[PDB]
Subunit: 312 residues, 3 copies
Amino acid sequence: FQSVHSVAVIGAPFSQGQKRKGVEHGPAAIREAGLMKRLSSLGCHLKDFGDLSFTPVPKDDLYNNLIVNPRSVGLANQELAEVVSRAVSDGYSCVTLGGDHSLAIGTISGHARHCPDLCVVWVDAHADINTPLTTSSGNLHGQPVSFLLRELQDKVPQLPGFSWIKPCISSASIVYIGLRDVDPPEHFILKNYDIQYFSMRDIDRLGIQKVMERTFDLLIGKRQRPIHLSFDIDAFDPTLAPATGTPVVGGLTYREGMYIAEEIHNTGLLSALDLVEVNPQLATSEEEAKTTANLAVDVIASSFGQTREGGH
Amino acid sequence: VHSVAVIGAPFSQGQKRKGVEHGPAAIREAGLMKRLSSLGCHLKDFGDLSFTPVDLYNNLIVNPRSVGLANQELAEVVSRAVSDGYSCVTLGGDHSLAIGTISGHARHCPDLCVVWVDAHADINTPLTTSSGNLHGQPVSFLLRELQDKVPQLPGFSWIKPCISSASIVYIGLRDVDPPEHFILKNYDIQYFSMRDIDRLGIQKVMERTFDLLIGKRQRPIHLSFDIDAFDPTLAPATGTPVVGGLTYREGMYIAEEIHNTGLLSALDLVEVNPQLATSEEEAKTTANLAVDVIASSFGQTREGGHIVYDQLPTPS
Amino acid sequence: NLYFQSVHSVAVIGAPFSQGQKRKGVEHGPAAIREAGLMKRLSSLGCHLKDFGDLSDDLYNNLIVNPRSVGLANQELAEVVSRAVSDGYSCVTLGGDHSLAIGTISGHARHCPDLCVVWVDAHADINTPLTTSSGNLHGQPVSFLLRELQDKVPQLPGFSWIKPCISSASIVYIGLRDVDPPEHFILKNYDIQYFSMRDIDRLGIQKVMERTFDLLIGKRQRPIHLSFDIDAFDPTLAPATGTPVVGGLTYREGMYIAEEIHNTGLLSALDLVEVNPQLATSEEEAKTTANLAVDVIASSFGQTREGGHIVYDQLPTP
Ligand code: PRO
Ligand code: PRO
Ligand code: PRO
Ligand SMILES: [Mn+2]
Ligand SMILES: [Mn+2]
Ligand SMILES: [Mn+2]
Ligand SMILES: [Mn+2]
Ligand SMILES: [Mn+2]
Ligand SMILES: [Mn+2]
């Protein structure tokens, strides 16, 4: 094979960062679409940690009539952070299957425990950077980055179950790609703190090649750094990825998404990847659910060396 | 903070396919007013105009009287909306309604320029049309340099040609009749076909469009936007669909660039025909797309940048 | 219409090969494309037309299926194409599976030894009889044609008539996205130039066509052979085909390729292959694929998005 990678796979069947049921079946859907076989065929040394079972929290209602399930979200992420830490500690590139995007709190925190100069490429229709004070929905899947960013620490209140989190990335160390549904406060956060982002509009103008070039220039232009790719399937157009809870029209094409993944592979710096927000229960047909899972597998496989030219 | 007037113009007699008169209602139902309200627009809804009801012309041109007259009535409403300080959004209805909207707009803004976003040039004369459908001719009646090639139709004498060939640019062209192509080339009318977009990219297409129309000075902009500019996969509920059109992204980009000028004075969103859809979702997606065009033309962004946001809350 | 920007002489041959692969139905490609109104469309573009109509075995090494039927059918097809081209026609062949390019290219080369090939396809179809995993000859045609690969290619039954006729420098691929590892090796090792979908994502279709022509006709005008597999298009656009691969050309990119081919004035033969109406799930899927096939062929002979191919004389006056 062109290159061998050691890859751990963690299922995180978690739904409480949002209100729509079924995203907890994300990890199963992706698995049934053949993830392990595909990574095997590419030369990957694989370790399957299986699908985690998160400790429920009995009482966990609306916090200040706004934040939904903070204790469950906080604890599930604390648990996931331990496993991701273990995997990275053991030397694996850590693939976590979601589950809603609240789980990036745990995956990035866990990763950061071993990589002080970690950087993040966040591929998403959404910035997910509302603080608990700026959120309109109160859904923590739209807040994960606020708890991780050092610059926002003074703006984030201490939520129950969240005391264990330490901000671990600076505003210069995360680049967003694919944005198209951004709240006014999130826009203010991005601009005010100099967080670099390439919205769908930036991609329309520059094209995905220049987007990736600039992305790497910003993050790894001066030195090599481990990369955490946090990939929300809703980055893709809903015609390609319909089985997801917060679809937004005018997303990435299949080609652009593969291009992102291929460029991440080509760095040789991919250290962890999240594939989140696949909700097969939201598909209007079996083939809608299966196409979304198949697309998830293509993203992950391309991140680990699958190409459009038979070079693997 | 835009003041926006919405006029329902249920034109159907510019073409032969029934249903297009329900376009203005389909768009309303898709939640147009809620969207423009969330954008901080000052809104006036004129409701749907009831035109006064009314023989073929040279055995070809159909219902021309009804079309000519309804356009005269439309043009007065647009004139007075513009006058009352509103940006004028006219919901269609077939594209023959542009005769009335551009005419009425050119009364108070003589220096207007036109961005025509369409699969079609709609510049056949009453003598070059094969179909006889007036939705395929509106630009011939409006264009100054073309007057001696256009005969006087019953109901159309009121129309004073108000735009020169250098003040209209087309974007999206892919189904242009031979006489149309002749007109485009011989009158030096600038256009960016699908093929020009494939070469240049929509960013460059918009830069060059504005260079041509407002390169010398700021001017009021009239955006005449036919939903069939978009690929039929995206906008299937429409009468003359043509494969290989704009993507969702390209169309939002045009609207956004139009907004970013701060010059948009009037906008037509034409040719949504809910009855031509093969299902209720196809009908609804077409109307949702129409809303997205209008909202982006007035400030909706892909970046959350529509409102001013000054200060983060503190747990302080 | 009396007046056109250009007038082409075009021969049409139906070549319903199905034996270069295993799925039934592709032999109905030529009928599907004719029923989508191909002849009418070409007439409307001012072409002089000659319609040649539609033309009408043990495993090799326990793998390669139908070598004699395929090798021999291609010998016959080669004759028809050579005749058409010799008589001054740009020769359009409707497939049928892609194994037919063995015949069309070999025949074309008899009269046009200096031809170049633009191969538009999800696949490189450059497996040898020794590297192929499927045994399907439609995945092997380029290996028979290429000079530099002759010593890597064994003599098959039905194939003694074929002389390799193109050098590795005279073929450029566009659209590649499903390349077997031994195919990747050949491409790199013989320095065959290709624009994969990834290359199109980076350069854009305009620069891909510019660079393609710089590679092939940059030094001198040469007859162009366009071998165009419908599966180069995204399966959402061309679902009716045997080996569909996600992430393909858009409608606009495909038409752009054909328009630029037309603009060279050098198009000398064109294959339009792999349309299999039976693999559609609906009549609209089948007809869309056939209509797209017609749009490709039409656009190769002057159909454009802007409507300048028919020449208009003067506007009537009232
Ligand atoms: O915070 C939220 O819940 C939404 C999710 C997408 C953008 N903001
Ligand atoms: O003139 C007509 O009626 C048609 C409409 C689109 C192109 N020409
Ligand atoms: O040789 C074959 O049969 C396959 C078909 C596409 C790629 N190679
Ligand atoms: Mn997200
Ligand atoms: Mn998202
Ligand atoms: Mn129109
Ligand atoms: Mn139109
Ligand atoms: Mn092929
Ligand atoms: Mn192919």
